[PDB]
């Protein structure tokens, strides 16, 4: 009845109806895994209860990519088409670039064959992996996150090789007008009235990478 234990525990995290108060509740159960197996008993029990997964790989954590989100196995299909849409414009393109980087990094576990256009993918993915990872105990609001993923899914950051993006993210967060953050937060999405400002501000950046 361990399945019933975890089921009657987690099933109370709902989004109630508009006649029952309109409240909500969000779970985050954390399952300890031994040697990364998804095929345990408790792991495959709680996966068939929870609405998604956030897989934290040991190998991605050992190589300094912290947080180590395995974006291949991590799916959450209730929150997609339910999220902040100004993120969701660039986030689908971000998903495609991360999936392409996963595929070409699996196809090149060692560097011997150079095609000079797949190297654009292998540059962009190691750029975006450096953009997404962050330091501990550091929350980032959605308006300072849409801009930092907007300025990396597009160009504006290929000038550094891979390294100083740890300075370049805080650089582009500092060097933009903080008036656009209020607009992108309150509007909800990247209007063309704000898309042209977002293309305008992103080219005058004093980027420390050269």
């Amino acid at each position: 009845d361990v399945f019933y234990l975890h089921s009657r525990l987690l099933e109370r995290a709902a989004k109630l109806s508009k006649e029952l108060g309109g409240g909500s509740l969000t779970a985050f159960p954390v399952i300890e895994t031994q040697a990364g197996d998804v095929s345990a008993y408790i792991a495959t029990n709680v996966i068939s209860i929870t609405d998604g997964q956030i897989f934290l790989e040991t190998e991605l954590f050992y190589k300094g990519i912290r947080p180590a989100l395995n974006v291949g196995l991590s799916v959450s299909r209730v929150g997609s088409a339910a999220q902040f849409p100004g993120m969701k414009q660039v986030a689908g393109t971000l998903k495609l670039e991360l999936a392409q980087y996963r595929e070409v990094a699996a196809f090149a576990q060692f560097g011997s064959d150079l095609d000079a256009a797949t190297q654009y993918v292998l540059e962009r993915g190691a750029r975006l992996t450096e953009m997404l990872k962050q330091k501990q105990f550091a929350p980032i609001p959605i308006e300072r996150q849409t801009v930092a993923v907007y300025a990396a899914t597009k160009g504006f950051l290929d000038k550094v090789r891979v390294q100083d993006i740890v300075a370049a993210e805080e650089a582009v967060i500092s060097q933009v007008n903080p008036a656009v953050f209020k607009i992108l937060k309150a509007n909800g999405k990247i209007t063309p009235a704000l898309d042209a400002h977002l293309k305008a501000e992103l080219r005058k950046v004093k980027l420390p990478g050269a």
Partner: protein, 277 residues
């Protein structure tokens, strides 16, 4: 059923040590050829600074020579120049010339027969049995010289380093039919070179292009040998990593199967005992 995953671990671990041995073999043999390739690189520059470099010529009959390896542990080498053979033989055909495709090495006849068999005549094998020697090059050159083409193309991988293998076309032309014809720029750029031969220029250029073919074919079947050792080195360190990750996954599955079997046969005893007393 727990005996399969232990003997599979036994198989994959010794395959891992086999490829960990053969990476040593190939990276060792890459170095003992490295004291000869730059020495065999000595005679490839004077002919090209003398004859020029004229590959894209409308020959009437041409012997393209794609030299390959012997043992098929290449790793991006044999099929590479197999596709390069048609890729440099297709841009050169425009008017329907005679083409005599020749492959050196046992892994040439296994691959070049599929794409170009009707223009395939000679397959020279066991050429890296002991080592590479110049009289072997003279003999294979003479066996090409029994026929009289208008040009030659030599497809071989230039060993620059242990990572880069750019295939090359070495060009050897027919002496009076095309070589002296292609030098006709405002007269002849060869006639400034004063001849010091016994007979006329027309039969010393025959000797010169036969020597050019023999030298460049020797250089081709030495550079392909050294890049073959380099590519077997680059392929045996991917089989070692592959038999490392496969061994890790099978060891994890052996541990999970071990725990499942001991838990199930313990549950068997407890269900046998508590249902008795």
């Amino acid at each position: 059923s727990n005996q399969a995953v232990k003997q599979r671990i036994r198989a994959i671990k010794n395959i891992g040590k086999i490829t960990k041995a053969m990476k040593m073999v190939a990276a060792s043999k890459m170095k003992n050829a490295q004291i000869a390739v730059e020495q065999s690189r000595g005679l490839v520059d004077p002919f090209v600074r003398l004859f020029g470099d004229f590959p894209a010529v409308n020959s009437n009959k041409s012997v393209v020579v794609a030299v390959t390896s012997d043992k098929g542990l290449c790793g991006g080498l044999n099929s590479n120049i197999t596709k390069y053979t048609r890729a440099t033989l297709a841009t050169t055909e425009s008017e329907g010339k005679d083409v005599v495709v020749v492959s050196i090495g046992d892994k040439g006849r296994s691959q070049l027969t599929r794409i170009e068999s009707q223009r395939y005549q000679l397959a020279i094998a066991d050429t890296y049995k002991v080592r590479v020697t110049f009289g072997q090059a003279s003999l294979i050159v003479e066996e090409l010289i029994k026929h009289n083409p208008q040009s030659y193309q030599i497809l071989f991988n230039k060993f620059r380093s242990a990572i880069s293998f750019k295939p090359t076309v070495a060009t050897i032309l027919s002496p009076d039919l095309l070589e002296k014809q292609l030098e006709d720029v405002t007269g002849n750029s060869l006639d400034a070179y004063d001849i010091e031969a016994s007979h006329e220029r027309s039969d010393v250029l025959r000797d010169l292009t036969e020597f050019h073919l023999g030298v460049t074919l020797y250089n081709a079947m030495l550079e392909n040998n050294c890049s073959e050792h380099a590519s077997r080195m680059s392929a045996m360190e991917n089989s070692t990593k592959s038999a490392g990750e496969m061994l890790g996954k099978l060891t994890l599955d052996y541990n999970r199967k071990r725990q499942a079997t001991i838990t199930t046969e313990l549950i068997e005893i407890i269900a046998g005992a508590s249902a008795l007393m």
